[PDB]
Amino acid sequence: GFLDWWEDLRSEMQSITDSQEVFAVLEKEVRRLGFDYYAYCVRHPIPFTRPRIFMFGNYPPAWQEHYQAQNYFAIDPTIRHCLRSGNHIVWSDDLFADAQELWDDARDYGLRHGATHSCMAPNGVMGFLSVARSSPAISPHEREELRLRMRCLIELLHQTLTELNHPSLQPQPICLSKREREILRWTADGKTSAEIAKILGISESTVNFHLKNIQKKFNAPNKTQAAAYAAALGLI
Amino acid sequence: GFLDWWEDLRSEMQSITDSQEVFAVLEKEVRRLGFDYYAYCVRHPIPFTRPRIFMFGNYPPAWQEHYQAQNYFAIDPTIRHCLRSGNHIVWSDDLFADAQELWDDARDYGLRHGATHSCMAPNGVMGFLSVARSSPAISPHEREELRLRMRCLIELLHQTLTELNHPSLQPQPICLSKREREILRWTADGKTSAEIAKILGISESTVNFHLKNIQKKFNAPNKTQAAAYAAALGLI
Ligand SMILES: CCCC(=O)N[C@H]1CCOC1=O
Ligand SMILES: CCCC(=O)N[C@H]1CCOC1=O
């Protein structure tokens, strides 16, 4: 049953070594879930004026290209950072009130019923897993069973991709030293370099050296971007 | 069998009356898991040098005091908002490799074996769940079973306390204005006030004027903490 399903699925993911094998095993499971297509979206908090949004899925090619040209990823409630009750939500006609053009188009493309579960990794990463179909309708008895299985899929997706180091789940890799990480904390808490020189006992001259070295790693012109990026990525 | 227990625990948890009854039924579930002690911890992202931590659990009161007096909550490996190895950490005799002074105190109070699971909410708040015992060791086949039963609990604990609107799960109410948001995003993305004056049709004195009122809400002395604090709270 459930224990059997999760056991075999953990085996397949721990066995592969390519990104394509991940997205082939998922498409198989989603077909077994009773849905026609799926879609996995990973978005990062940085940059704040242009959050990177990545798209992976098997939606009909005519729709994947429509969803990109029509800029639907900017008015889509499914991919929204807002808090969702239980991180799970089923596609409702009223869910797309401020996006009636997106929902209307999706229905004539064979995407009438589906759900979306949103995980959240501690490094700013927030994943969205969507499953869609057209003929069936989410039966209530299936509602609760669907949430549990999809939380399994997106939790094992996150696990395998980050274990395989796929660039979508790796937002701006930056190595921080034990001394460099603790300097950036007190700067992020608003204390000046002259004050951090005593907290750590490393002198003001040497404190500024590490900060500038951190600015170089962040592509940061100043120390305010280095602190904001580090705070959003949970690196601090 | 599993899907049955989840729906049962899900329905019994729907009784939103008091938080005391919530922590009680969680206690009975840990007992059903075969463990003697538990401890739930709510973690807010700021301040970065001393995160606001709310402590709930049935750990020995003298241990929760010694665990707090010595400030182990900052150097303990059981909690870690980073390198989430499957988001599960079956306490290993090697996990406490260095700085394992609290590993002696823990086993003296009767906590020989256990595990800890963590979860992240879109609003930056992060929860930690642990179960402890001292009589047996953790078998690998029940360990794979532990990953699901525990992830379901901390996922249903955040879900419940968010439905009850428990005050510990609420970050500081430091909301920004519309223009105050557009300006904080740019300042956090590294660029100076003089260039934001060019991006918008606004003067440099007016750009730096909002930066003063933004940090007044955060009670921050400089602009670096303001951007860093807003980013952690997901406000930018
Ligand atoms: C998570 C990817 C976005 C997504 O699923 N959008 C939905 C809106 C209607 O048709 C779709 O495909
Ligand atoms: C993860 C929360 C803290 C925790 O459960 N740590 C345990 C390990 C042994 O002594 C403790 O206090």
Numbering used by the authors:
A (entry chain B), B (entry chain A): 6 to 241
Paper text:
The majority of traits controlled by rhl transcription factor RhlR depend on PqsE, a dispensable thioesterase in Pseudomonas Quinolone Signal (PQS) biosynthesis that interferes with RhlR through an enigmatic mechanism likely involving direct interaction of both proteins. PqsE is a thioesterase that triggers transcription of the RhlR regulon through a hitherto cryptic mechanism, which we identify here as involving a significant chaperone-like component that enhances the stability of RhlR via protein complex formation. In common with many other gram-negative bacteria, two QS circuits use N-acyl-L-homoserine lactones (HSLs) as autoinducers, namely N-(3-oxododecanoyl)-L-HSL (3-oxo-C12-HSL) and N-butanoyl-L-HSL (C4-HSL), which are produced by autoinducer synthases LasI and RhlI and activate the LuxR-type transcription factors LasR and RhlR, respectively.
It crystallized readily in the presence of C4-HSL or mBTL, but not without these ligands. A complex with mBTL diffracted to 2.15 Å resolution and yielded well-resolved electron density for the ligand. A complex with C4-HSL was less well resolved (3.5 Å resolution), but the shape of the electron density confirms similar interactions.
